[PDB]
Subunit: 152 residues, 6 copies
């Protein structure tokens, strides 16, 4: 449908989310890039958020735990254009009860066209990118026109 533009700020609002068997990976990743991450705004789901702040002293805006709605809170923030980057390490080897929430979240990150990482390799390539700390124009769906065509 109709697409418009949005500018990701130089200072990104990053969401960090990880499944239990993936928390250790996210932790190491975060500790390895702390100096850089400290330059942006950090958000996370309940458990993930607390484990990170307690371990690194970084300021993290913790949302509810994933199974309790954290994923949907993050999804909502992305739709509202309040989250610019999503680092979501989900477990591809273990059945998760909130699997629909997981798919719904990834679905929204895809439609709102924001940088998304589901593994370390992708996360490294993203944060080591030269424009990670710059303003970046992205194409996003034009809700205004979308809804307008719906009310006709």
């Amino acid at each position: 449908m109709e697409l418009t533009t949005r500018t990701l700020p130089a200072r990104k609002h990053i969401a960090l989310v990880a499944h239990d068997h993936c928390k250790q990976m996210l932790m190491s990743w975060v500790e390895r890039h702390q100096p850089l991450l400290e330059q942006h705004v950090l958000y996370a789901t309940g458990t993930t958020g607390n484990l990170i702040s307690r371990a690194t002293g970084m300021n993290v805006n913790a949302m509810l735990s994933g199974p309790m709605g954290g994923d949907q809170q993050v999804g909502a923030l992305i739709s509202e254009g309040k989250i610019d980057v999503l680092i979501f390490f989900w477990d591809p080897l273990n059945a998760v009860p909130q699997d629909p929430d997981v798919k719904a979240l990834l679905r929204l990150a895809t439609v709102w066209n924001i940088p998304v990482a589901t593994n370390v390799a992708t996360a490294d390539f993203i944060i080591q990118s030269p424009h990670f700390n710059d303003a970046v124009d992205i194409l996003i769906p034009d809700y205004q026109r979308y809804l307008a065509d719906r009310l006709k």
Copy 2:
């Protein structure tokens, strides 16, 4: 233990959501109960919310459209205890792309134990219940004890 208590106010915060093929059904339902619904606070996804407001003249807090993240916004409000009742007329005869969002939303409504109607019959029974206009206590999981246990 693992559960606590929440009190639903007399003036309920109602979320109204409907798939395209079920919108007429929801519209009719809303019209036949405009008198009572006017005494409560209404929320709704994009398209649904506008249609209702333009047809009945009631104040409706419209969020994004479902496919664009509206379901997750509703789910978020529910997890935050800002939505007391959910009327979600999803289409059981049509496949939708935001199906994971649909499932995730119903999953949260189940978790947070709030009144949920997925069809007209259930909506009618719920709205005709006595203390529907009264303050009612519901059992909800104790998030504090939950998160605390997570961070052991």
Copy 3:
């Protein structure tokens, strides 16, 4: 789609189903409302059924266990107009093997427009509704007309 009507008898045919982690939740709910439930016809899936009759002494028409086909037996009965109310406490925090059966059962309960509760709050609202003990009409899809078109 064409719609016709069906009359819910005063003495409702209630199906009671609960996943393992919600069984104590359902049991407790049934005992609290025994004086009321005793006035209706009860049906349930294998395990749930036996646990109820053995704990309350009430007569329950037990079907097969969910995983073994119980869910579909209930779905069939619903489509056939033999079940008027569905109380299905599925687990929102645990993945189950018969998940497709769960979704298929809730899909049909939605299609045939009967009161459905997936949590305690909704269930309480339904049974306290004034017409829970009266005969009431509900709108249902007109199958004959639906099939005629299919063969048109």
Copy 4:
């Protein structure tokens, strides 16, 4: 879990089901095997059943249409040991709203261990197999034991 046995009678109770895009495929298959199928008991979902009846003239016990509950009716019969063979030509190239019912039906057919064909090739192999026309014993889960242990 403990297993027991069930006998599949010579005269089989067959459930015939097909998605719209696969109906023609099932119709052709049923027509070229009519002489044999006429010897067994046929069951089908609503639309499929009616189409087969008027096209071949055979007697078919039509259940409700799939989207309307037909699939679960068939599942119910299978779990009750009333269906011996399932011919389900579902469409692998088109999204279906009753997808959960489709997966649920197939899950049950697996559980109760009855012959199941989801395509023509499997359907042909099945009906050309010797035990299709005679009684044969199959292993099934022992429900009694299963339920007893649950309690």
Copy 5:
């Protein structure tokens, strides 16, 4: 859509896949038919493959374990016409994380119209079928015409 034909060779390429809870049931099925299976070419997912080889001494082309991609490797071979029969005993009573890989594999087997068995009864009917050791023509999508219309 547009169809064409393929001929399964008398000597079939069989893929054997089973979830943990169904492995033993697959082992018993294999040994019970070893004489016949010995005359064919066997493929299997990682764990399943090695278990069969070590127990019967039959040669088996072992692929990666299912969760690691083995289901997709089998799916790939099927679409390439390298697999003629699929014996997939998936667990109908236990959810697996690679559930999508399971559905995708079954979806392809359906599309490419090859004999497929998800339980013992179906597997026995197919294996006991007369033309199991003969060349058999099956109808398959005409990929050429298919891709041609796309562009």
Copy 6:
């Protein structure tokens, strides 16, 4: 589980896949990055592969169409370590018949820890990252040890 490492060659093996409604976006994206891509080895699903080679003249190893097995062929290549990067613009606003294949493919990409992009924003950050043209070590699961424990 036990992990090991793998080195992604400087000259990457890239898989390009896109759903119909996303083909135009991928196309123009490839054209705008043609100079970079020309120095690598490209793979793609049926339709997508031909459209690209036809419009850019680049050499593309085309597999089968996704709905016909293409996604599984790609997943197979990934698990075998023959694909280093995956660009998959799947349609988040459309229900696809091969949905399971789509998820299975994304699941493997996650498991094998290779760079993956599902939208333009992510694709741009990845291709501009410095290590894109350099040999890179990634953490992958140790299959040998994994399989050995399975046969214990």
